[PDB]
Ligand binder design. Structure first.
Ligand SMILES: CCCCCCCCCCCCCCCCCC(=O)OC[C@H](COP(=O)([O-])OCC(O)COP(=O)([O-])OC[C@@H](COC(=O)CCCCCCCCCCCCCCCCC)OC(=O)CCCCCCCCCCCCCCCCC)OC(=O)CCCCCCCCCCCCCCCCC
Ligand SMILES: CCCCCCCCCCCCCCCCCC(=O)OC[C@H](COP(=O)([O-])OCC(O)COP(=O)([O-])OC[C@@H](COC(=O)CCCCCCCCCCCCCCCCC)OC(=O)CCCCCCCCCCCCCCCCC)OC(=O)CCCCCCCCCCCCCCCCC
Ligand SMILES: CCCCCCCCCCCCCCCCCC(=O)OC[C@H](COP(=O)([O-])OCC(O)COP(=O)([O-])OC[C@@H](COC(=O)CCCCCCCCCCCCCCCCC)OC(=O)CCCCCCCCCCCCCCCCC)OC(=O)CCCCCCCCCCCCCCCCC
Ligand SMILES: CCCCCCCCCCCCCCCCCC(=O)OC[C@H](COP(=O)([O-])OCC(O)COP(=O)([O-])OC[C@@H](COC(=O)CCCCCCCCCCCCCCCCC)OC(=O)CCCCCCCCCCCCCCCCC)OC(=O)CCCCCCCCCCCCCCCCC
Ligand SMILES: CCCCCCCCCCCCCCCCCC(=O)OC[C@H](COP(=O)([O-])OCC[N+](C)(C)C)OC(=O)CCCCCCCCCCCCCCCCC
Ligand code: HEM
Ligand code: HEM
Ligand SMILES: COC1=C(OC)C(=O)C(CC=C(C)C)=C(C)C1=O
Ligand SMILES: COC1=C(OC)C(=O)C(CC=C(C)C)=C(C)C1=O
Lengths: 95, 176, 354, 79, 454, 95
């Protein structure tokens, strides 16, 4: 569950048995919040996938580029091993 | 009895090291061998590997925090007990802004977006939690030393607790 | 689960006035576990492609295999004895009047057990088993094409053995789950006492009731060990050690002793379906024996004359089943069935006022 | 040797508010005295079992709250 | 383990207790103190235990009528004289010991000796006084007029000592109270209040020689001795249960559990005192500077955690000693639903002495035991009780230095040895009053005197 | 569980999770009771079986005698059937 301060409940109504896990994930909201939203029945449901498409893939490829140098060292080793195996087989056998 | 002898050995060896200065409070001059090592290896290693690698990682971390709009201390997980004990005693002003930043960060991360650059010119490594982390550690160390110096015996699996130490009911599988 | 165990075994309170007839259930649970374990272990050495030759290889080649073979056969007899005695008890003390939910959970296990035992007999792959299933399967011969789907061929073959074996392997594990549902209702709906009322005389289970329940189980073990190693009572028909021959019909196609009540019902009634239907009545009517009553009483601790005549009806029908189909036994057995219907009507009927 | 005091020390002031050693009566037997030797109405010995704490017992009053709950809130499965 | 001697120089700086035996056999013990008040009284070796079944209650009745007038005074004159001296007369009656002590000023020491001697030696047991006291004793006898701690104290003896006179109560059964007469009391005085069983204790600005002279003069005509008490075998400890289930007296349940203890003179008595200190006491309504959740007492700390509410509204250990037997156990006052946890924890605590007792807990207990014993010796009455109770129990008064010397030797290992010998796997007696659905059978609780671990 | 009046608890201490079934079998004792007993370690543990032996078996056989007449009617029927089977077999076959 969350911290004991977060899961501390203001109300004295007993926790329903089916909502035990729900109320063990309670947070004590500091300062308040104003949450808003609209039903999906009155919204475009596929546009946001398109709107966020370029940025999603840019920020994904920029992070995955961190592994480029590691990837190249490993492929260089893969090629060196392959060639070493071939030359070794041609040397042991192959008159 | 050989246990009674071992108890005297332990008692006498600990009585002979009471008041000893910790290893980190002793003025220490590095061995000549270490000095040679720290003049050949350390310089080159920093210029070619450590320096560049750790700047590469650090700069990325700062950018990630700036994208989320969060501070470094916001990233701490409250599943750590020192963090929880510190978060109990943070003032409300710090607490309110900490929650709002973490909420914005999770919204942005979930929706695969980044904070507008207009809002990214800040220092994310300001240690605003430091005073309360230190207080929490002090409180925990007192409890450790004054209340948990022995593996206590308790009636097992009673009152919703295993008796092996945990204090919350129904917090293990065998305690369901 | 440790807290659950402590709540249901260590701090479980039961009345101190219960007899040794309240230990039968503990024995069922223990003997049931033994039947699963021995079954799984026997499976390690058994080839269901020929279970006649497989049982021979267990008793002659496997070290201590004879123990596994005879325990699994004799402990079945034991399971049915204890279960049938557990029902007789529940009828005598009318423990279905206020604890019907417990009774319903038990009946579900009884239905499952009736299927497990029969199919296990056929895994023996002997004359009696083969012809017995060939006779039972032909009772649902009216439902078009269903015999073929169950058998897998136009006659019982290893194809049928390979599928029933899976039901025999898996259905016991489900039975163990229903045993939990049964112990759940027992612990919520408190057990009935030897007295009709409810009294503040309860004592914890581990320190008292389990010691007594073990004295009971060890008493039964002494007797079961004697049967297991010396066959003091004939509980297995000898004709299951004859190699199957589809051309020759056995001297008598009968089930194990714990299926003779329903075998007789089916051999007494003149129409095949009527017999099947009267078997359904036997295992269904007993689930509504208190539903039509209207008095504030549980009809408990009277002379139980109707109960005694019912228990004897069961024993007498088992006898008629052993006997060959001599006409005389059929007439007498039809009267015993008419009498059972009447005794069951007596339980069901509410009373008018003078 | 005999123990003449309860295992739980009172830790409170003996003299009552505004009362002095001159005007408290005789503390050995005065009704308001907090150290009055108890009465042997049924004999001597029961003081080894007696609860000398003046406040009446409130059955079930909580003393094991580590600050995890507010007053009046019922814990559910210890959470 | 041995950690040194805690005896100090200040422990040796105490005025000596001078004990002399008068020719008649009466012991006179005195200790000088720099005080303006004194305590002079008579600690007798009498009590309910030394009464027969038909006469049980006579000693308590006599103790209630001894100050209601003498053969040389009257109740009004006696009360007037004591008041003029600025003194007060006290008295108590127990199972094995009795006392009649006066708290007076310096000038009232010898005059009070005269008053006490007249009451003890020449009691005027007037019928009218007896009849009025019969009503008061009868009202007190009613259990509705008795606290639950007094009720369980008596029932523990009734259950544990079914075969001997220690099971008898001091007040006595109502049948005996209804029938006691002057002749009963006169016989009790003659048989039990004899010189060989009396100790005259004087504490304060007193001189031993002067007290002795006055004592010999005033107690000259006391009966020198009575026949020796009949020799009996060790009081048999009956592991029994005497529970008064009552679901119509509120939510609080009172439970007392007893083990067989040790006599006064046993070498293990101080060990049992320390074990009693380790158990300690706790009240939710007076927790002290340290809360239960953070207490050094292991029983208190674990109890304070149960169900996040605490399973001990109140509890205390008890160590009761008699000449040839003793009772050791604990008393609990707790919520009905908490009784199973409460008795389970305190029994787990007593069983822990035989397995896993830390040096830290022992050393804390030694200091709080010494802080309780020494503080009890602050006033003259406290000293007088200590002298009179210790001479009757031991034949001598143990010095504070000697008590500390013997306590220094006792360690965790010694507590473990004694507990293993006497308390582990031992027979117990449970007694209770109140809503006790959670109280299990005696056999269930007795299995908690040993552990499967360790 | 027991009646709602019986399981109604006087104390406000929460029911321990391991004692749920125990406290669902609570009874509200009316008028009070004085229960007494002695440890089995200080008692004769087999005598009562002997002391109660005659009365136990007398009151058992007197109750089981209720079934005598039912038992005799059933045995008479068993004998009649057996003989009927034998005579019928000897009549159908057996020249
Ligand atoms: C009438 C006769 C009917 C007869 C019976 C018919 C039975 C059903 C037949 C269905 C046939 C296909 C219908 C296609 C139209 C959309 C249907 C639909 O799902 O509507 C809800 C919704 C329509 O989107 P919307 O944002 O609610 O439209 C709001 C306004 O109507 C308009 O908003 P807007 O136009 O202002 O712009 C917002 C949004 C509108 O986008 C769309 O409407 C396009 C939706 C996908 C087509 O624009 C975009 O997101 C541009 C997307 C460009 C994608 C290019 C990919 C290459 O479409 C979806 O949710 C599509 C989900 C696509 C899943 C793809 C993965 C499939 C994997 C399996 C294989 C296939
Ligand atoms: C140095 C050696 C000194 C030897 C002194 C001997 C002596 O005088 O004894 C007194 C000496 C001290 O007695 P004590 O002063 O009364 O103290 C009692 C405690 O036992 C004293 O023990 P503790 O309380 O001090 O506990 C420590 C205990 C702890 O002992 C252990 O933990 C034993 C070691 C662990 C188990 C090793 C198992 C190895 C399994 C390997 C499997 C490999 C598979 C591949 O240590 C010992 O047992 C002795 C330790 C000696 C060296 C110092 C450490 O007693 C013992 O050492 C007793 C040991 C037990 C044969 C026929 C059988 C029947 C045949 C029937 C058919 C024909
Ligand atoms: C090829 C693969 C093979 C795989 C094999 C895998 C095998 C796995 C085995 C796993 C065994 C797990 C056992 C868990 C027990 C949990 C007991 C429990 O709830 O304790 C709560 C209990 C709570 O602590 P506490 O309040 O101090 O103790 C309260 C109890 O009174 C403390 O108990 P107590 O002092 O009252 O009793 C101690 C002991 C004493 O037990 C006895 O004296 C009776 C022993 C009977 C043995 C079975 C006889 C069977 C005869 C069969 C004859 C032939 C049949 C054919 O009894 C028990 O522990 C309960 C036994 C219940 C047995 C019921 C079924 C019988 C069949 O302890 C714990 O929670 C801590 C320990 C937990 C277990 C470690
Ligand atoms: C030259 C060689 C010579 C060799 C000589 C050898 C001699 C050996 C002598 C051995 C004598 C042993 C005596 C033991 C006495 C102490 C008993 C005791 O402590 O019990 C308490 C102890 C339990 O303590 P408790 O719970 O506090 O008290 C139990 C009762 O509450 C207390 O009430 P109770 O008195 O009724 O208890 C008696 C017994 C009674 O228990 C039973 O009887 C259980 C079976 C009930 C059915 C009984 C059918 C009776 C059929 C009678 C046929 C009569 C034919 C007469 C022919 C006459 C021809 C002239 O109770 C139990 O043992 C309880 C067992 C619980 C079993 C749990 C499962 C129950 C399932 C539900 C009931 C059964 C339903 C199916 C059957 C329905 C039938 C319609 O019981 C036992 O565990 C004792 C087990 C042993 C029983 C006696 C065995 C006698 C064996 C004699 C052998 C003679 C051999 C001679 C050879 C000669 C060769 C030449
Ligand atoms: C190849 C080798 C095969 C070996 C086969 C035999 C294996 C035997 C395994 C024994 C297991 C015994 C139980 C687990 C270990 C003890 C756990 C324990 O101490 O639990 C304490 C608990 C409780 O015991 P306790 O030590 O806390 O004592 C509390 C008081 N009594 C004793 C009344 C419970 O033990 C049980 O509950 C049991
Ligand atoms: C309700 C539990 C069970 C009962 C009542 C039951 C019944 C029986 C019966 C009556 C037999 C015939 C024995 C003989 O041939 O005479 C049998 C056979 C067999 N059973 Fe079970 N069984 C049980 C559960 C199991 C389980 C869980 C397994 C393991 C998968 C198993 C494995 C076997 C095997 C392999 C055989 C064939 C070997 C044999 O003939 O002994 N059984 N069973
Ligand atoms: C696999 C077989 C079953 C097992 C494991 C089993 C197990 C048990 C157990 C352990 C008990 C509690 C202990 C007892 O009082 O003896 C019990 C009670 C009971 N069972 Fe079963 N049972 C089985 C079969 C049945 C059947 C077939 C019925 C119904 C015809 C049934 C009906 C009952 C009833 C009514 C009770 C409550 C008795 C009373 O009120 O205390 N059981 N059973
Ligand atoms: C209806 O279920 C049955 C019983 O339970 C009531 C039996 O008692 C019996 C009779 C059991 C024995 C041991 C004679 C059988 C076979 C039966 O079918
Ligand atoms: C082999 O013969 C058998 C019978 O013969 C009709 C049965 O009645 C029964 C019992 C059938 C039911 C539906 C209770 C079985 C299992 C059996 O094996």
């Amino acid at each position: 569950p969350n911290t004991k301060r977060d899961i501390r409940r203001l109300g004295s109504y007993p926790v329903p048995p089916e909502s035990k896990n729900f109320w063990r994930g309670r947070f004590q909201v500091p300062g308040g919040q104003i949450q808003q939203g609209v039903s999906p029945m009155q919204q475009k449901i596929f546009f946001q996938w398109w709107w966020n498409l370029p940025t999603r893939y840019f920020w994904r490829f920029t992070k995955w580029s961190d592994f480029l140098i590691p990837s190249l060292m490993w492929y260089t080793g893969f090629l060196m091993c392959k060639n070493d195996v071939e030359e070794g087989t041609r040397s042991r056998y192959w008159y | 009895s050989f246990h009674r002898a071992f108890a005297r050995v332990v008692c006498n060896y600990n009585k002979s090291i009471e008041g000893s200065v910790p290893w980190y409070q002793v003025k220490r001059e590095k061995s000549p061998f270490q000095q040679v090592w720290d003049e050949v290896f350390t310089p080159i290693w920093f210029k070619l590997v450590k320096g560049p690698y750790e700047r590469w990682e650090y700069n990325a971390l700062v950018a990630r925090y700036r994208g989320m709009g969060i501070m470094a201390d916001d990233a701490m997980n409250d599943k750590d007990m020192i963090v929880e004990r510190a978060l109990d005693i943070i003032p409300e002003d710090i607490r309110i802004q900490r929650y709002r930043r973490m909420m914005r960060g999770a919204v942005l991360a979930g929706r695969k977006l980044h904070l507008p650059l207009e809002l990214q010119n800040y220092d994310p490594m300001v240690p605003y939690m430091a005073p309360y982390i230190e207080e929490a550690k002090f409180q925990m160390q007192e409890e450790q030393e004054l209340l948990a110096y022995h593996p206590w015996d308790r009636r097992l699996y009673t009152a919703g607790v295993s008796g092996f130490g945990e204090t919350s009911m129904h917090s293990t599988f065998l305690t369901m | 689960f440790i807290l659950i165990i402590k709540d249901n075994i260590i701090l479980y309170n039961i009345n101190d006035s219960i007899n040794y007839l309240w230990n039968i259930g503990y024995i069922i649970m223990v003997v049931m576990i033994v039947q699963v374990i021995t079954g799984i272990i026997i499976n390690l050495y058994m080839n269901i492609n020929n279970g006649y030759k497989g049982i021979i290889y267990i008793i002659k080649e496997i070290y201590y295999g004879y123990i596994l073979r005879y325990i699994h056969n004799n402990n079945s007899t034991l399971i049915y004895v204890v279960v049938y005695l557990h029902i007789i008890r529940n009828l005598y003390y009318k423990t279905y009047y206020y604890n019907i939910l417990i009774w319903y959970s038990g009946m579900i296990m009884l239905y499952q057990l009736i299927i497990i035992g029969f199919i296990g007999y056929i895994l023996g792959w002997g004359q009696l088993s083969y012809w017995g299933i060939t006779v039972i399967i032909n009772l649902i011969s009216g439902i078009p094409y269903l015999i073929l789907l169950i058998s897998g061929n136009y006659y019982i073959t290893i194809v049928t053995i390979k599928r029933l074996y899976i039901v025999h392997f898996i259905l016991p594990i489900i039975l163990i789950y229903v045993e939990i549902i049964h112990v759940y209702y027992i612990h919520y709906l408190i057990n009935n006492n030897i007295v009709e009322y409810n009294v503040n005389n309860k004592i914890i289970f581990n320190n008292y009731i389990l010691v007594k329940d073990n004295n009971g189980i060890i008493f039964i073990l002494n007797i079961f060990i004697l049967e297991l190693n010396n066959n003091i009572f004939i509980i297995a028909d000898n004709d299951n050690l004859i190699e199957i021959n589809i051309l020759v019909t056995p001297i008598h196609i009968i089930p194990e002793w714990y299926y003779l009540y329903w075998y007789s019902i089916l051999k007494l009634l003149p129409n095949k379906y009527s017999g099947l239907y009267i078997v359904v009545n036997s295992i269904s009517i007993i689930n509504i024996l208190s539903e039509y009553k209207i008095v504030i009483s549980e009809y408990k601790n009277y002379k139980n004359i109707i109960w005694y005549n019912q228990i004897i009806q069961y024993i007498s029908m088992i006898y008629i089943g052993i006997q060959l189909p001599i006409i005389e036994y059929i007439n007498y057995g039809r009267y015993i069935i008419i009498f059972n219907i009447l005794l069951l009507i007596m339980y069901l009927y509410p009373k008018k006022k003078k | 040797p005999p123990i003449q005091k309860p295992l739980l020390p009172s830790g409170r002031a003996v003299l009552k508010h505004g009362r002095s050693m001159l005007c408290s009566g005789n503390l050995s037997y005065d009704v308001n005295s907090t150290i009055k030797a108890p009465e042997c109405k049924r004999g001597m010995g029961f003081t080894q079992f007696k609860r000398f704490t003046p406040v009446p017992i409130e059955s079930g009053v909580s003393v094991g709250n580590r600050g995890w709950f507010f007053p009046g809130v019922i814990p559910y499965q210890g959470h | 383990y041995y950690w040194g001697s805690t005896v100090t120089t200040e422990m040796h700086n105490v005025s000596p207790t001078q004990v002399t035996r008068l020719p008649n056999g009466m012991r006179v013990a005195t200790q000088f103190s720099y005080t303006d008040s004194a305590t002079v009284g008579l600690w007798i070796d009498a009590g309910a235990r030394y009464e027969t079944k038909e006469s049980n209650g006579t000693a308590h009745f006599l103790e209630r009528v001894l100050y209601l007038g003498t053969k040389n005074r009257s109740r009004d004159q006696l009360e007037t004289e004591v008041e003029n001296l600025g003194a007060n007369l006290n008295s108590y009656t127990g199972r094995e010991q009795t006392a009649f002590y006066a708290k007076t000023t310096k000038d009232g020491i010898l005059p009070c000796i005269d008053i006490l001697a007249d009451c003890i030696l020449n009691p005027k047991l007037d019928g009218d006084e007896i009849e009025k006291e019969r009503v008061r004793i009868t009202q007190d006898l009613q259990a509705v007029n008795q606290s639950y701690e007094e009720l369980l104290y008596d029932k523990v003896h009734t259950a544990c000592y079914r075969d001997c006179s220690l099971g008898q109560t001091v007040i006595g059964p109502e049948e005996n109270v209804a029938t006691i007469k002057r002749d009963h009391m006169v016989n009790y005085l003659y048989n039990n209040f004899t010189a060989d069983r009396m100790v005259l204790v004087a504490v304060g600005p007193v001189d031993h020689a002067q007290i002795v002279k006055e004592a010999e003069k005033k107690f000259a005509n006391i009966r020198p001795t009575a026949g020796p008490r009949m020799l009996e075998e060790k009081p048999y400890f009956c592991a029994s249960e005497l529970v008064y289930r009552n679901d119509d007296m509120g939510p609080t349940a009172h439970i007392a559990i007893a083990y067989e203890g040790v006599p006064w003179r046993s070498p293990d008595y101080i060990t049992f005192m320390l074990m009693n200190a380790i158990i300690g006491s706790y009240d939710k309504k007076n927790e002290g500077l340290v809360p239960g959740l953070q207490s050094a007492n292991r029983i208190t700390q674990t109890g304070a955690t149960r169900m996040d509410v605490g399973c001990f509204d109140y509890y205390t250990g008890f160590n009761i000693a008699y000449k040839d037997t003793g009772l050791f156990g604990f008393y609990i006052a707790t919520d009905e639903v908490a009784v199973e946890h409460a008795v389970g924890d305190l029994m787990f605590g007593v069983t822990s002495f035989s397995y896993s007792l830390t040096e830290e807990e022992v050393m804390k207990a030694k200091r709080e035991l010494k802080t309780n014993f020494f503080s009890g010796l602050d006033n003259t009455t406290g000293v007088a009780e200590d002298i009179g109770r210790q001479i009757l129990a031991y034949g001598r008064r143990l010095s504070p230095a000697e008590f500390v010397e013997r306590l220094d030797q006792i360690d965790s290992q010694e507590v473990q040895r004694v507990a293993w010998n006497r308390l582990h796997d031992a027979e117990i007696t449970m007694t209770g009053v109140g809503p006790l659905h959670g109280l299990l059978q005696l056999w269930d609780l007795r299995r908690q005197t040993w552990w499967w671990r360790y």
